[PDB]
Design a protein around this ligand. Sequence first.
Ligand SMILES: Nc1ncnc2c1ncn2[C@@H]1O[C@H](COP(=O)(O)CP(=O)(O)O)[C@@H](O)[C@H]1O
Lengths: 113, 113
Amino acid sequence: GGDTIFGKIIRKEIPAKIIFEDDRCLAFHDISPQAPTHFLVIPKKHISQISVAEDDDESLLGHLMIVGKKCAADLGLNKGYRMVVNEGSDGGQSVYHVHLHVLGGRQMHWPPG
Amino acid sequence: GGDTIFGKIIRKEIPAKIIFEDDRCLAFHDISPQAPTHFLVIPKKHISQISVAEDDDESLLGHLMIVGKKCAADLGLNKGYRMVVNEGSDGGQSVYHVHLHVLGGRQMHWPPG
Ligand SMILES: Nc1ncnc2c1ncn2[C@@H]1O[C@H](COP(=O)(O)CP(=O)(O)O)[C@@H](O)[C@H]1O
């Protein structure tokens, strides 16, 4: 689902510590975590960045989060966590396939970067 | 609606520089801005934290995101931005009512807190 490394991972072309999968997304642990628990929830539809998402991707986008809070519960993150979507340069996006970051396992700080 | 500060704002007790509103959500500038452009998007129905959210609130959550991107774009955050949702303790939540954070203007750093 796309011409980025997230696509290769979705296509099972390369490995990722896969956490959850359904027909429209895939959750896996970040290869370079910034917290004890750091995983990603990505959709299989190739949306490059959130600013490019359609009104018609609303449920899908909400699914990513739904999936996000579920998988967090199942990783023993009962004390809280932070969810992050980055858009472009200023935002710090590393891969141009939209995705949700879920980080837990320590105190997250303010500001959020 | 709500008991919280955000319930007070949904019910116009205290004003807010409203960027957007609809039947489902409300977007307003943050009074403790962490970047040049820093705004919040809360749903009008009371969900206090993301872990108590049902699969039913999926499109409403995708909607906060869709509106988030709309507003960032309407407030001209063309270089990028970052959306952050805070969960419980570890997440740094004090305001117990679901809310999407949108930050822009400056370069956002990694890790996100
Ligand atoms: N009257 C208000 N108008 C706009 N934003 C507000 C108001 N009161 C509180 N907020 C904002 O609520 C946001 C914080 O919510 P949380 O992320 O859940 C908790 P914390 O600030 O402890 O990290 C802050 O950015 C703060 O400025």
